Amino acid sequence: TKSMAKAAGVKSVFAVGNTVYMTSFGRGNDAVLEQKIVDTSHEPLNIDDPAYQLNVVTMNGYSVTGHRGETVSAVTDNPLRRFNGRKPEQSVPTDMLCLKPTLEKKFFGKEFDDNIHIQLIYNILDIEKILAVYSTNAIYALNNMDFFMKRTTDETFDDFEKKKESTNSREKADFDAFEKFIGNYRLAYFADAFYVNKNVLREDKELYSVLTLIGKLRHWCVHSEEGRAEFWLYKLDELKDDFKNVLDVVYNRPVEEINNRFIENNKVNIQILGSVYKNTDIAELVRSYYEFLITKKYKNMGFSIKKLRESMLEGKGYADKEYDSVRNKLYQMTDFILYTGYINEDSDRADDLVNTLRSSLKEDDKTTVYCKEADYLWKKYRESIREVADALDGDNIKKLSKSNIEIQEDKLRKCFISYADSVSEFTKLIYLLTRFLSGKEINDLVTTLINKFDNIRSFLEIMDELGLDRTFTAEYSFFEGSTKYLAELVELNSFVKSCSFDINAKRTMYRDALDILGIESDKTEEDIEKMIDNILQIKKNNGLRNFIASNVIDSNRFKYLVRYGNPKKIRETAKCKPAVRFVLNEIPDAQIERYYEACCPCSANKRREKLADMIAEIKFENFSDAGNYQKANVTSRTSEAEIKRKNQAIIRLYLTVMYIMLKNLVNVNARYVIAFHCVERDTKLYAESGLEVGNIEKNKTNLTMAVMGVKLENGIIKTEFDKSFAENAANRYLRNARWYKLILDNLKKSERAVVNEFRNTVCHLNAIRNININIKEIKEVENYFALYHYLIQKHLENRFADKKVERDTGDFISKLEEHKTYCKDFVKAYCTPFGYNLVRYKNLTIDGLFDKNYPGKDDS
RNA sequence: CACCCGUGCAAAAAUGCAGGGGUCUAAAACUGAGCGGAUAACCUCUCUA
Ligand SMILES: [Mg+2]
């Protein structure tokens, strides 16, 4: 199922001039040159330890059998022939967009007769795509509740503050929007970015500088810019002092929190590991534990230590409920034992495991490999793991916490994560960006960024080894330090999720908490304020207060939900039975019994139905008696504790279902803001390439129309379909007649205003900002893609209900009500702006082909 | 179960086979990671808000 060429070890098959360079897998993603192929002749590079031998070379195929791992044989294609054969006959291929010459001429200073620089440039574009997703998400988080979309680094707070007495309404209203935002309590959910210990809100200067660095990032990543500001993400060393200082202060605090007293906070794990590693010096063990836990070196070593631990401790008896309070320490130190074993004594085994994982053809093969390695690790570490578990008793952890250890930090401090004065402004800004995401988004951003920078570094080293012109342009010299940025980003990914600067739950936080949970309609605003006074006690009982704080405010599900949704809006969206039920049967049985075992005191369909009924009929007053049972201990068998765990299961289920809905909707919108970022970027790229595209702000389909060669005559596309326009397209995607005809037909069925509104509700995330009203009447939710496009099309209907709509748009909106679901034709109608990129158009207009995790059938 | 590309055969211009694709998607292999519905320098629960 997986690629045999990768299993055989073929990292890449490049193409420079008439020669073809085959590269192999090094340490991780490092690429080492293996063979150079010049017209059916192969010259073996990397003679000692070759990853693969190539037993026969043809002009149209390189047969390669694998040395490393299982001896698998593969056939690989000649890149010079990538667009030749059955059509001069050997030329370096162009990218699908046919933008490769312009990308080379823009990132570097000249066209390149090879097939490596474009490979690097597409990874840079992937970087910008991910940042376009996540700066947009951060701005939507700040706007959830025309100002954040015009924030420029060029003006500091000392110049933005002069807009208090601005004689002009635009500047005065911008400053008033800034004040109305900082005065918002919602900044308390952005506490890492906006709250400092003195917890107080950061001063207005830092408050504004965070917003400027975030909004300018969004503007850069979505709007292709002109002038010096086009390279703003890469010329960040020119940031003003205020922005540098705010980047520093936001980045330093997790670093300072973790490495100020690493011995003290990690004393329990350090001591119990010193018990296992008696022969090891305590300073060495402390440095290794920093490397493992803070720096996360156990994840960079080319195999899943987490998978090995899970397969080793599968059924040995540590799945019992007793260790749940211990399980974090137990898993951490099992991973540490495995790690230290792999650097110290099982380095050969780690290499022999990475090789067989790379050479494996199936996930079943990877599973068997991990299982066998975990069997060996268990048989090696039965007593080590038993010692770890025994020395994690509650009394034992208490005594370990009270003990005094004066461990030498000289060897530890050589591994301390660099402070903000050493890391770069780009990675500091990336951390500041990460301050406005959930944890899953945290990973999807920072791990993808380290992947892309690692790819760029590997390409740069390959081109240096081949002697190719590696020099980026003076404006893109940022990527000449790609190795340094990769190191910084991996270091940041190590500790980005490790620190949470959570604040004491404010009164407005508690207001959001019950609003997201549900209140009876008849209760007035003063009544809700009186219930807040009851929670906060204006003898004393903070039981319900603490229950609401722990279960709702401190739940990252609710944290996410107030990051990207008004609590009242989320509560309203909790009332759509089809959409909540859809998440209900997406959560598996294993994760449904977790809630039902507490919400019960028989069939899974009935269980999910009643769970969804509870999500629909949930309110504060069902939990208003939490002052009685919150003081109980969930682990006990008292009825107060049982009811406490029941309410915890209900609240967690509701918040998690809403979290899943909102996260999936935001992810689907993230794919479309990728699409529109690509539209806007490729517009400028094609304009540089001499394509006649024109202004795309006015009409977002200008790019696809320019690529297809069609032009609207009197507002409608009057050019018909013929093979000539298909074959003379501006890119490889639309060289085919069938999908050219389909995209032309769907272009004729769209309109400028609807497409512009779709772009606006995608970038500004208004479809989610108004999720409650955009989800009112939905019949079923076959997938999150369907729900997102129903929200989008309902948003389009609401704005275009009292305006002139073309016949096709009217038919789409009528089909919206004829059966209450999104229009599978409207999606491809307003998705035409990125129809030029046929793969993206197909993915974003066809369900099943949208997401990788739930693949479905193509609708042709 | 997308798109494209190479090759072999049938084709009279596209279908079976076998593959490849970092240079096709959110999308190369190991990882990291997402899907995903607890993970986190900090035992847990209570406490503190
Ligand atoms: Mg790519």
Author numbering: 58 to 144, 148 to 205, 215 to 267, 276 to 615, 624 to 686, 692 to 950
What does the original paper state about this entry?
CRISPR-Cas13d is increasingly used for RNA knockdowns due to its programmability, but off-target RNA binding and cleavage of near-cognate RNAs hinder its broader adoption. After binding the target RNA, the ribonucleoprotein (RNP) is activated to cleave the target (*in cis*), and other RNAs nonspecifically (*in trans*). Cas13-family enzymes differ in how they recognize the target RNA, but all use two higher eukaryotes and prokaryotes nucleotide-binding (HEPN) domains to cleave the phosphate backbone. Here, we investigated the molecular mechanisms of Cas13d mismatch surveillance and nuclease activation using a combination of cryo-EM structural analysis and quantitative kinetics.
A central hallmark of this structure is a kinked crRNA and a Helical-1 domain that is docked and interacting with the N-terminal domain (NTD). The 5’-end of the crRNA spacer is clamped between the Helical-1 and Helical-2 domains, but the 3’-distal end of the spacer is solvent-exposed and wedged between the Helical-2 and HEPN1 domains. These results are broadly consistent with earlier studies and support a model where the target RNA first hybridizes with the 3’-distal end of the crRNA spacer. In the binary state, the crRNA is bulged towards its 3’-end and makes the distal spacer more exposed to the solvent. Remarkably, the binary, intermediate, and inactive states retained the same overall active site architecture (**[Fig fig4]**).
